[PDB]
């Protein structure tokens, strides 16, 4: 391969594939913090051109953490269809970008081609894509999964009901649930982060969610977003199993930071098949985000975009019902501003869809980052046009307990009625029977949690 | 005629033609989440948006608020410092905030006690208001609790510009068996006084991971009350020294 | 009225309506430069609340330049339907916002209601709208006009072909036209900004545009974007008339800066009626933008959003075929970065649709502003979801002559195929007959200007 | 291997299966605009996007960069400032660039000739390349042509950080009947040497509007050549003194 190019008479030389992957990124706060960012705009474009001229075999054969030293690398490498790979190994990343974006490339064409990718190659395509490339590219790569709802069908748009409370108070959780359902939020999942990580608290919060689900016969699923080991214990001891959640990271060191082993996720799939109240074949739920490997000391000199793609290669092995990035959940150290949070949101969603997972996004920011609620509404709409499978929903987007701002219940109803998108077909049918939705639109009686009483 | 920061604005119900308005009041009462504000089409009502934007203006101010150092002196605390100089540098460098500067190491080896069973550290972190509002209710019954029916307690001190992985260097310098750190998390929208505790058994900078920590979070008046949360941490520190383990390594 | 509120125990006092209107704006560099911006976020929100408590009467009866002193104010005030005004005069701006956004408010409802508005009231609503408010509100307010194409039908999306050259060279203009049509750009207008304001040069440019139009029988408009006086002279002396263009400003002094009298625009209507090759009843073309009144010393202490609303009230009197704001066309002194340029674009489009004009946007930036091509692509898609009537098209968005970057020919085709939008129905018919479009999508042989040869 | 700044990269045709490939070359010959680069779906091709991105990085640099103070001195020009100190303040404060600083007024009265018929002013404006590349081709035939079978010419001078309304103050102080400003217009993506002329008859700060000015724009080797543009500006200056008007007030 070439690791050099000439731009405006100036030779630009890079040490390895990892540096070319790092420096071809659009400017963000975490790349500078990792010490891996481009020194100037000219070197960024030079890294982009070197990357685009590098071949699929070049980047596949140079993963950012080695095969012997990393179980996530091994999992990604071992999942490759080698026949798909051998078709495309001598393509440049430029040609692979133009292949993905082409109207002559069908969903079934990409269905086979993506099996010959690794995560680093997926990242490499995203790095030489513009914002509209990322949106149009993701839109023509739908990923459809099924729990008790079907998510990811083109023309649909789903939402996580996120009814979090400071005390895990079951009246406060139920109140937020009745509110979300009245806006048509919850077809992805009704998903609580608990304050306490123990079995009888998990079971009580699950009883509260499924109390509402069973009373009104809602086609959806519940989730309590504790550590996966505590979920498994609760479900084994006879709590209602819906989705089983784990936060993941794109290296073995990053998983060890999170306290997760791969056999826990294998156990999660087996516990799902025995116990869980799920009609379809997908029951896992992952959350990811740029910066997490950097925070763990577990990026190994790789940029946060490459590391986040490796999350999606990891997630793909376990065929989850849903995955979302949590784009501005951490803070300004990794993504500083409106434009960095938008760009990362579009990158993460494109890379997820290319990896063949059911990719949504927590469009969000923190109060110590340079962002506001207009950012969330900018990003949610852009991602909706990219066929983002789901976003979050909270009352006006205020998380009273995780101390950040995500998207409102209002925002899902807004996006659906703006873009003529529907819920999950099972959940839409329920909304119409409750008198909450007609023809994709909130009725007069909608937006009112008192309707359930 | 409304203050947006008032209790009346907080309790406001904006649903236009409600099915059962007495339920809405009880739902509004049940939670500090912003329910029952209704809609205009699919969009928030104007007052709900105004109260959102008012709270966000207040929230941004709390992130770069700092303690007076003479408040820290008046609590009887040693002030000690990270590698970070300014609040603007803290927000952009995590890596400098989880190791101490070169005069901080020499301050801890001269002034604080050597090899404690329990060692309590306070940091402002991401919210100063979290450790200002809560301090008198947290720190006395915690520091009494570890001594009164316990064993060897450490001398407490303040780290400026601290992130939580700094407590591994604190545990290695002082030789500490249990290292507790009480630290401000991110300010939320409506509230900036949420405190967290992060705690390791016998930390080591090379070896220990984040899963080795026990977290107890949302310590304020609208979560778990700081008096009874101090009883939780002392019981947790007793349970740490008994089974020689913390976090994911702890039983049940 | 109240000029006064208490927020977090502190009293926030304002001098007049003008100060409230200014400080309620989202932060931009132009308001700071004008000296009119809020001192903090708290005072911005206080100004928003004071504004939202004010009535339609309060703001109508305080225009930012007085009736007796300003011919644009007189035009805006005298065009009010007073019966429509008397229905809504005691509405708060809060109530007017919620009326606009309501799903129970139909297109026919707003059609009468907007006739009771003045430009200052239109601005007042926009100032207390979020980004998603501006996008959703504008989308439920379609404005449809007709020349040789119909623009602004929901489900459609149009584009100006902008084939500019440094020398007005007729082969370089034609080459850019053949490129643009091959991507399906030009259903709004084929519109050249000329280097020389000169009847001989204007006619030669117009002969070149209409050379292509008449050869391939294209349903569209030609325009040459010189000063309106030289357009009228050229058309009188027998150059092909399509659209007649003028840049406009929201005050009399601003119009004097541009060398524009109101009677020139009356003359442009009458010349269009006598001379112009237009099947429908709309034949005028205006361009606007935030900062222009401030540049002219003609804002009179008012913010640039309120001034830009007054453009649309001026434009509405002449019932033009198309108006667009030129959002980042000037530079960072008035709108600094991505975030400000997006917000202004959403504001300007919402205000144009609320004023009842056929509102599009030049989604654009300059090379001395903090901005890149990804911002253009962010904004063009957001505005397209808002039902933006049209954008610009140039080869990769590079103006070789006006020295800025707008949207590509690619970008209109991307928007259409992303969002399932069509061209103008007349122009789509032509694209289908030319083999350039099938079912909304570019065919294989599209994107290639050699097709025409 | 390809330099994206090369002539081969600029001449590239990216349309993949052409209808008539000989027409495609002739269309690329006719235009500086980025025609004929093809597509991937409805998106730009990779090389077209890369060369766009390269040209933007270079165009961004032409904004910040400043003419050597010794280049102006070796050109034999007076240098004079506006109210603006630096390039960062220039971009955000147009009002300060339309006014001479207090020392600039006094220098103009000291050192320039009083009550000229034609005054030539050169400013960097928003493009230093525009005045650096073009100068030796535009300015000596401008100063000759106004003199040779002509009239009372001013002494030419440089204004740093000038925006075009500063020529109203220059005309007032110097008593000039015609003020010619040659100024750098804002830089394009692939091109940064575009010069504009702004000229005004007998200007006054209180009363002169923008429409009273004549513009001649796009002066460069890809536009109107600076040699033959100088003859246009001399002809315009002659006409402006003849009919005692400029801009929209001029005939024909
Ligand atoms: C931001 C955040 C994260 C970030 C961490 C990056 C970062 N720079 O902080 C990411 C996205 C990685 C994350 C991941 C997870 N987190 Co977290 N996190 C938060 C949050 C919102 C902020 C905490 C904070 O501001 N700390 C204070 C600042 C000043 O310290 P800091 O140095 O900047 O941040 C450090 C700590 O926050 C720590 N940390 C972050 N999460 C967790 C979780 C646990 C169990 C521990 C021991 C430490 C820890 O990592 C950082 C060190 O670099 C809190 C919510 C809250 N109520 O505060 C939850 C919270 C602390 N996390 C929670 C959980 C459960 C998780 C996960 C285990 C999710 C899961 N179930 O799989 C993962 C894995 C974390 C791990 N074991 O390493 C729980 C902890 C429950 C408990 N008491 O045990 C909390 C309280 C939220 C909740 N769900 O209730 N999280
Ligand atoms: C940016 C711009 C504008 C901006 C003004 C910038 C500002 N207010 O800050 C806006 C959008 C307001 C504008 C408006 C118009 N402009 Co203009 N503008 C440009 C552009 C792209 C840049 C000029 C530049 O960089 N100036 C250099 C900087 C350093 O000077 P500045 O002090 O910061 O800006 C001043 C001048 O730009 C001046 N100005 C801008 N346009 C025009 C046009 C004329 C005729 C005059 C006398 C002055 C003038 O206004 C500013 C005073 O603060 C040029 C195209 C080019 N390649 O140059 C056209 C250009 C100069 N404008 C053009 C025209 C025709 C117009 C309009 C008359 C359009 C119309 N048909 O109604 C209006 C009215 C101008 C007026 N009388 O005020 C023509 C001039 C043709 C000619 N040879 O006379 C040009 C060459 C573009 C073209 N179509 O070919 N424009």
Curated annotation (Swiss-Prot), chains A, C:
Its cofactor is adenosylcob(III)alamin. It catalyses: ethanolamine = acetaldehyde + NH4(+). GO terms for cellular component: cytosol; ethanolamine ammonia-lyase complex; ethanolamine degradation polyhedral organelle. Pathway: Amine and polyamine degradation; ethanolamine degradation. Coiled coil: none annotated. Inhibited by 5-adeninylpentylcobalamin (AdePeCbl), a cofactor analog. Irreversibly inhibited during catalysis by cleavage of the Co-C bond of the cobalamin coenzyme. Reactivated by EutA, which probably involves an ATP-dependent cobalamin exchange. GO terms for molecular function: cobalamin binding; ethanolamine ammonia-lyase activity. Induction: When grown in ethanolamine and adenosylcobalamin (AdoCbl) (at protein level). Note this experiment was done in strain JM109, which expresses the eut operon. It is found in: Bacterial microcompartment. Belongs to the EutB family. Catalyzes the deamination of various vicinal amino-alcohols to oxo compounds. Allows this organism to utilize ethanolamine as the sole source of nitrogen and carbon in the presence of external vitamin B12. It is spontaneously inactivated by its substrate and reactivated by EutA. This is Ethanolamine ammonia-lyase large subunit.
Curated annotation (Swiss-Prot), chains B, D:
InterPro entries: EutC, EutC_C. Its EC number is 4.3.1.7. One of its GO terms (cellular component) is ethanolamine degradation polyhedral organelle. Keywords: Bacterial microcompartment, Cobalamin, Cobalt, Lyase. It is found in: Bacterial microcompartment. Disulfide bonds: none annotated. Pathway: Amine and polyamine degradation; ethanolamine degradation. Induction: When grown in ethanolamine and adenosylcobalamin (AdoCbl) (at protein level). Note this experiment was done in strain JM109, which expresses the eut operon. One of its GO terms (biological process) is amino acid metabolic process. Its cofactor is adenosylcob(III)alamin. It is an enzyme of class 4 (lyase). Transmembrane segments: none annotated. Partial trypsin digestion of this subunit (removing the first 28 residues) yields an active protein less susceptible to aggregation. Catalyzes the deamination of various vicinal amino-alcohols to oxo compounds. Ethanolamine ammonia-lyase (EAL) allows bacteria to utilize ethanolamine as the sole source of nitrogen and carbon in the presence of external vitamin B12. It is spontaneously inactivated by its substrate and reactivated by EutA. Directly targeted to the BMC. May play a role in bacterial microcompartment (BMC) assembly or maintenance. The basic unit is a heterodimer, which further associates into a trimer of heterotetramers. 6 large subunits form a core ring with 6 small subunits projecting outwards. This is Ethanolamine ammonia-lyase small subunit. It comes from Escherichia coli (strain K12). The gene is eutC.
